[PDB]
Ligand binder design. Structure first.
Ligand SMILES: O=C1[C@@H](O)[C@H](O)C[C@](O)(C(=O)O)[C@@H]1Cc1c(F)c(F)c(F)c(F)c1F
Ligand SMILES: O=C1[C@@H](O)[C@H](O)C[C@](O)(C(=O)O)[C@@H]1Cc1c(F)c(F)c(F)c(F)c1F
Ligand SMILES: O=C1[C@@H](O)[C@H](O)C[C@](O)(C(=O)O)[C@@H]1Cc1c(F)c(F)c(F)c(F)c1F
Ligand SMILES: O=C1[C@@H](O)[C@H](O)C[C@](O)(C(=O)O)[C@@H]1Cc1c(F)c(F)c(F)c(F)c1F
Ligand SMILES: O=C1[C@@H](O)[C@H](O)C[C@](O)(C(=O)O)[C@@H]1Cc1c(F)c(F)c(F)c(F)c1F
Ligand SMILES: O=C1[C@@H](O)[C@H](O)C[C@](O)(C(=O)O)[C@@H]1Cc1c(F)c(F)c(F)c(F)c1F
Ligand SMILES: O=C1[C@@H](O)[C@H](O)C[C@](O)(C(=O)O)[C@@H]1Cc1c(F)c(F)c(F)c(F)c1F
Ligand SMILES: O=C1[C@@H](O)[C@H](O)C[C@](O)(C(=O)O)[C@@H]1Cc1c(F)c(F)c(F)c(F)c1F
Ligand SMILES: O=C1[C@@H](O)[C@H](O)C[C@](O)(C(=O)O)[C@@H]1Cc1c(F)c(F)c(F)c(F)c1F
Ligand SMILES: O=C1[C@@H](O)[C@H](O)C[C@](O)(C(=O)O)[C@@H]1Cc1c(F)c(F)c(F)c(F)c1F
Ligand SMILES: O=C1[C@@H](O)[C@H](O)C[C@](O)(C(=O)O)[C@@H]1Cc1c(F)c(F)c(F)c(F)c1F
Ligand SMILES: O=C1[C@@H](O)[C@H](O)C[C@](O)(C(=O)O)[C@@H]1Cc1c(F)c(F)c(F)c(F)c1F
Lengths: 142, 142, 142, 142, 142, 142, 142, 142, 142, 142, 142, 142
């Protein structure tokens, strides 16, 4: 029923910066798309974004206590944070890793995720629709 | 309108072998699920499987000439074939890489794909539903 | 006399999550054990935990100005943070690195610490008693 | 006209800690030197320091929206943060990376910067004067 | 009740050689300290040292048959011996790895132990007191 | 007072070849800019360029005997010559490494310098002004 | 009772090519030796060779469905094929890897097999008799 | 007199796909050019292409039995196939490796060939004329 | 006629320790099996075991002087000893390397043997029968 | 029309030293062969050899100013010189890299060229005829 | 005055085994040559050989207590033993490492010595005369 | 009879620069010592030094034509020059590599020599006497 969508560093800059790359969709519009699609699937999306690792960890902690699934786009921390991986290893519901860009078509350092090994699955390079597709997997898996 | 779903080596063994891991769904049932979901989205799925790299390459060639999108689960060749990557680099429509299992939770050799860098996107670890989610991306991107 | 015990990310989740692994002891109980053992050794333990690197750094800074020893379980940041290492390189009193789990029996990425090279010593895999043993070293080294 | 000087973790500890290494100049004195030199060049220096990655990212974001150049000494995050690099890749004005110490004469881990590839240029090992020299480049490049 | 303390190559040279580094304590004094502390904890320490891998292996074998815990400072063999690791993998009681020096502050080759992955825990860099702290863990874990 | 500016292989080709990359400034103009700026700082710049490692080494030798500072752009030899590093390790006055291009934004082989570890500091990617900024550091450090 | 001997690429060239190296025995003679020895052990050897990975995979599939043991000399695919490893991971009876030459005395690339980790055991460098010895293990293990 | 020109995977797609890169020459035209140039040199070119490794191996086998020289563009298998290398190691006449594109100016994985170590020589990056130049070497070496 | 079977460190612990892994067969029983099978083949097995590298080397030396073949299970020294390899490089009769467990299905460090490159062949993972199969190769190769 | 053939270190020793390896052809004879073949193609070959990197660089510079193609056998500098690569990156006409020996059949260090990535193409292992074949490519590409 | 010559594993096999490689000189003859040359230089050579690491360590210990110089050919342990290096790091007189063969012309694993970094110097590949030359250095350095 | 002593880059700076490290002996004194010792052995030493690789190569060439032995201290080029190695591979008389300092006790890059694999032997860390000891080997080997 409840699904947590968690965006990490720099995802608040979505729809600025690099139109050709991630889409001209902003993070507020992204919140709007997700919530609407979530309601259509009979779910509630709680969508949160932060540039603070501590904040992201608090949100993962709450999802762990609540046994709620998480869709997570950790931004740069995907490639660097063991702390975030440790927090997510607690999750009992599904963890779906989502990246807007195709991380495997960029620099080599982006082709390693500390999250993928513990995630249920990963969607990359499908733009903002990756979030919607993660919602749909979660809807068919209850 | 037309979408090619191409499975490589060992995907004909789906629904035997390892129930706990990939699902008790067989490849014939997979064909059935895909085709049904494809029709519901207003698409036609052509679903083909082969253990022969030459056969897979011929199918990619035909999709290249026809300018048709491809959903591709190359099996083991994902990690080993430069030939298949070269064939796919020709595709003008989208290429979505799909793996039933979470390749990042297995052996290290499975965490490198020669296909990901040239694919539009990648779905891993979401079971058979990854194919359906790839269909839906293709349906929203025409 | 005064000893600072500093826990980093995810150590507030101790005694939840993974009973078999780290103990069913919570972080509040850990605070209680440490403080009691500290008093028995004639020391005062100031025990602090945070998921925020900035907070951990502020605490290391204060210990540096006060010339106070530090027992540090940095959590995931053990393996990733150069910033925390730089802060700790200032410490003039002893720095004892402590990990509840045996980091050398887990993933390869956990077998490298940016802190060990500058620490006085390291205790891993001895459970919550590692903190108590660090206290005792500090008590015999004044 | 406006130039942002951004210092990351541990740069507030400048002028304590290690006299022989970075100078006995404090961060307040550094602010003072920069601002004075900036006025002499006809510029305004906004000089900010934080141990918080989130704070540094917010400041980079603001410089990106304002199209303002940045002189950045990210401290330890130089070597570890993909998030900070992603934020800086947005900057349209020049980014000058500055390190007080010669990072190439220290540990091997310090000889890789996630920032250098996207910076306009890099000054290392020239002490506090590196900041002043970055100001002068910015003054001659308008 | 019975605890085996096993020192490997060069530990008989303790208290010669390098006063500044390992202590001016000799191995006979070390035996004396351990035994005294062991009695105070209600344990019996059997402390043995050898430069011969075969001898160390025989001692590990005997501890394995007797189901006795082992505190082991294998000296150089820590970094090189698979044979010793195989012998120790048999131990059913706890194995505590102890190094007098901080092996992580020395050459890179010393930062890998074939023993750590199979040990219960590891104490490094706490001088001769590491042995005493290992005794205390063993005393609190019966 | 006297400062030696030493350019290595291919720096005589400056202002030909690649206008977009290094500037349309020629090496003669570079000599002119440096000398003029040097006089303005109260210094004398001796600016020499050679494609011959032996010649560069002779010049470093002379600066070593004269106890004169050196600004050095070794060209390709930056990345390849141990001989040049050995010659420069003799210098008692400051050695400032300068690269016109941002070597960290190019091929991986250019991100390692045999000179940086022994240089006082390094300026890269600031164009021809890097030489002028090196002069200014040398002027403020007498 | 039934045992499948499967040779991969280039094993049909046995007894040509390189007399000194693999033996002057041809593949037909090898079939003959195996079958004769198999009958003497009370087994039936089905011996098949192909240069086609697809063919080898079909044969492994059939052995998997039949729960029959396999002796496998995959030729070059030993070192390169993940597909073949995936097919063999299904086998419920024993898989014995056999190489005529000593692969560890040749090029480095030949010292890694994708098959060894999932095989029951491996025989290399014992010439054609390795096949016979694999038969004998299979005969003593029913 | 007789020379075998063997093209591997994807070489039948020549003259489609990527005009700027490999030429707008098709594989049929390539056959035509080769055969014509071969006759002019007094040779007969047998030119064959296949996407099937098994087919390529059969052709190498036949050239080995016939003691005929081979010009080989293995396509992607250049970088991946040990089987093909083993087949070619049998050749007693010259083996000339040919690549239309400059493989050293592309991805790193293309700069290693399993064939080059056993080939007589290698021609890369000279377009379709590389085949003609290989023919001419073979004509001057009888 | 005479064959030397040499077991290294920890092989005297066979049939204790790990029933599921190596067999509940003891080393005395192993001696008994080998000797009996050896007599049945018309050979004499001299079977020796030691935890001492010096002892193993003396035994290899004697086999070298006597021109006698050796079956060798060096235990942990397989992966670590250059000395043992040097001793074995002298052997003029066959050297067969034998491991009871499948070393390629364990830790990565066990997949490299200093002995395999100089051995005639290697048998791994076939349990105690590997020794018997080595005897049989030696019986068919006189 | 004009083509520059440039040989680097040790190519003046051709036809001495190692008859079996590079040919008993001397460098003077090589000059003679090239010039004759060049005239037959309607070209003029300027053939120069030097053991001095500075000399080679001067010659590349002149070809760059003259917009003349270069055939280059840099000798050992192939594998070591960034300076020479930088000089050659200026060339606007074709650069053909030529090696008499098959560099891929020798030591590993010879299988990397700093020149190949910027060359038009590469000919190796075809003996002295590689130079002639490079001439012919240049003749067909005007 | 007194000099210790210490040979490790397999050096007692000198003058057997491999005439072409190390010389037909035996270890007894080597003792004889050394002692004679030592007397001629006014020194006493104590020459000892053992296949036992423990024995070698005891001998190094005695030289350490006696402040006597050591010439050491550790055999295979050169490349593998940290224990022996630790023992030798105690030596206050000179340590000269000697290898009869040129270790840099053999396998890659032989080109790393744990002893060279702590030795005064190293002589390799000069046959048995390396020992004599080490004696002469020791004679000129008192 | 005639022996060539060849010093490479920076060896003319001997006896300046770093008294503690290489000796206060100058290169002229070194020439004097060598020549005197050479005469005492009945040899003639031709001692030459250059900072120019081309010059060193010319000298190696002359020794190759004259079949004269070479003692070579290539300086920095030891670690970097393939050209010099190629020149030296021609030498038919002995090549002895000599380094004044212990290259294995310095930076890692100095522990690899392109010359050692082709030299007869190597002397390092024995100061200027290494040259004299090389002379003596050459005197005993005619
Ligand atoms: O923050 C990141 C990257 O560090 C990550 O490699 C990909 C990533 O997770 C993705 O494609 O979604 C994300 C990409 C990305 C950014 F890198 C970024 F800076 C943004 F501002 C942004 F909106 C964005 F989506
Ligand atoms: O063939 C493979 C693997 O080599 C790949 O790493 C994952 C993979 O592409 C996926 O999870 O879909 C696929 C996994 C896989 C198998 F490995 C396999 F053997 C099957 F029989 C099968 F049905 C299957 F799905
Ligand atoms: O946070 C970590 C790990 O990242 C670290 O590798 C070990 C570690 O420092 C330790 O064993 O103490 C610590 C382990 C750890 C956790 F990883 C974690 F998620 C917790 F919730 C927790 F309570 C805990 F103790
Ligand atoms: O924080 C860092 C290092 O992590 C970085 O490698 C160099 C670095 O960016 C520089 O030399 O400026 C900076 C060095 C540094 C510190 F590492 C540090 F801890 C300080 F307290 C400080 F003031 C300081 F300048
Ligand atoms: O023998 C060793 C080293 O090889 C190991 O790296 C650390 C080590 O196990 C420790 O710090 O206890 C130990 C250190 C050490 C020594 F290296 C040594 F040579 C001694 F003589 C000694 F007394 C000693 F304690
Ligand atoms: O010669 C080099 C490069 O090899 C080096 O990597 C950067 C480098 O030192 C710099 O950016 O200054 C310099 C760059 C460079 C060149 F590479 C070059 F070829 C020139 F002709 C030139 F003028 C030039 F400046
Ligand atoms: O095909 C291979 C090699 O690729 C593999 O490394 C060893 C290998 O499996 C073995 O020794 O059996 C096999 C060796 C081998 C060959 F490489 C080969 F080309 C043959 F023609 C052949 F008959 C043969 F036995
Ligand atoms: O198939 C390949 C590549 O995998 C190889 O790296 C280069 C390669 O052998 C060459 O440049 O000839 C060849 C290049 C290549 C292709 F990669 C390809 F997909 C084609 F369709 C094609 F016609 C073609 F020539
Ligand atoms: O001693 C070893 C290992 O170090 C080796 O990797 C495998 C090994 O040679 C084999 O499987 O035979 C052997 C395995 C092994 C053991 F590792 C061991 F500790 C035993 F007690 C034992 F009986 C045994 F057989
Ligand atoms: O100088 C070199 C080598 O360093 C390079 O690896 C191959 C190389 O460029 C080629 O095969 O042409 C060339 C080979 C080579 C030599 F290495 C050499 F020493 C010569 F004397 C010579 F005549 C020669 F041709
Ligand atoms: O034992 C060794 C080798 O492991 C080492 O790499 C070289 C080494 O130290 C040397 O050349 O002296 C020595 C060489 C060596 C041997 F390897 C060996 F087996 C002998 F029997 C022997 F007499 C001998 F001298
Ligand atoms: O030039 C070098 C070094 O590059 C090399 O690593 C050691 C080296 O060959 C030796 O110890 O002899 C030599 C050392 C060396 C120097 F590095 C140097 F700069 C000198 F000025 C000098 F006199 C000298 F001997």
């Amino acid at each position: 029923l409840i699904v947590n969508v968690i965006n990490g560093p720099n995802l608040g800059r979505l729809g600025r910066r690099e139109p050709a790359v991630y889409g001209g969709t902003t993070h507020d519009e992204l919140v709007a798309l997700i919530e609407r699609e979530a309601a259509e699937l009979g779910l509630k999306a709680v969508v949160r974004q932060s540039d603070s690792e501590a904040q992201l960890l608090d949100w993962i902690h709450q999802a762990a206590d609540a046994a709620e699934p998480v869709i997570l786009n950790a931004g740069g921390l995907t490639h660097t944070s063991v702390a975030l991986r440790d927090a997510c290893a607690e999750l009992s519901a599904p963890l779906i890793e989502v990246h807007i860009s195709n991380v495997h078509a960029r620099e080599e350092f982006r082709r390693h995720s500390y999250l993928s090994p513990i995630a249920t699955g990963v969607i990359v390079g499908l733009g903002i629709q990756g979030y919607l597709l993660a919602l749909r997997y979660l809807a068919e898996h209850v």
